[PDB]
């Protein structure tokens, strides 16, 4: 199994981007395995 | 070696497992995308240089170079590179992961798994982190994961 990379674009801000998504505020914990979980 | 955003592919057919950022001669992606495997770039080979499972990050060819951070107020853009689709910009106001060690920006955007590693940009075009490590609230929310330079 070989893994390879292909260029897909410049890193640039686009003035005409689609805009979407919420901005939730969440209490979370980060464990040793890099996994985030919700906390109450 | 050119600066830019890249697909991370694997081989029957090919499948896109993730995305990463080339900057200053270093390739940046999420650990869970490559598990630290060497990467082919044309006839060249990219070897892992630094990685950390808890941060879910890895750099190739040199140390992590990305250091911009979300300002906590402004909208940002996910430069999403989904499998089979042209790179595209999605603008959003991040929410926040509140943790015992401080706050992390988070984006409530749910793109295919092969988009993991896609950069999140501030208004100046600087990469403030990578997309693809997060939590489910049933919508997925990704941390804005940034490394240390």
Residue numbers in the entry:
A (entry chain A): 49 to 88
B (entry chain B): 18 to 28, 31 to 156, 159 to 170
Task: Kindly provide excerpts from the paper associated with this entry.
Here, we present two crystallographic fragment screening campaigns using a 96 fragment sub-selection of the European Fragment Screening Library (EFSL) provided by EU-OPENSCREEN. The performance of this subset was validated in two fragment screening campaigns using the model system endothiapepsin (EP) and the NS2B–NS3 protease complex of the Zika virus. EP is an aspartic protease with the catalytic dyad formed by Asp35 and Asp219 and has served as a model protein for finding inhibitors for other aspartic proteases like β-secretase, a key target for treating Alzheimer's disease. As a second and real-life target, we addressed the NS2B–NS3 Zika protease which is crucial for the viral life cycle of the Zika virus but with its shallow active site challenging to target.
The protein construct contains the soluble part of the membrane bound NS2B co-factor and the protease domain of the NS3 protease/helicase protein of the Zika virus. The NS2B–NS3 Zika protease is a heterodimer, the NS2B co-factor wraps around the NS3 protease domain and forms part of S2 and S3 pocket. For the second fragment screening campaign LigandFit and PanDDA were used to identify binding events. With this campaign 18 fragments were identified as crystallographic binders with a total of 22 binding events. Out of the 22 binding events 10 fragments are binding in the S1 subpocket of the active site close to the catalytic triad forming π–π stacking interaction with Tyr161. Fragments EOS102546, EOS102659, EOS102811, EOS102592, EOS102818 and EOS102869 form π–π stacking interaction with Tyr161. For expansion of the fragment hits seven representative hits close by or at the active site were selected. The binder based on fragment hit EOS102659, EOS41783, is slightly tilted compared to the initial fragment hit with an RMSD of 1 Å between MCS of fragment hit and initial binder. Binder EOS41783 forms a new H-bond with the backbone of Tyr130D and interacts via π–π stacking with Tyr130B. The compounds EOS41783 and EOS90861, as well as the fragments on which they are based, were assessed by TSA, but no temperature shift was observed.
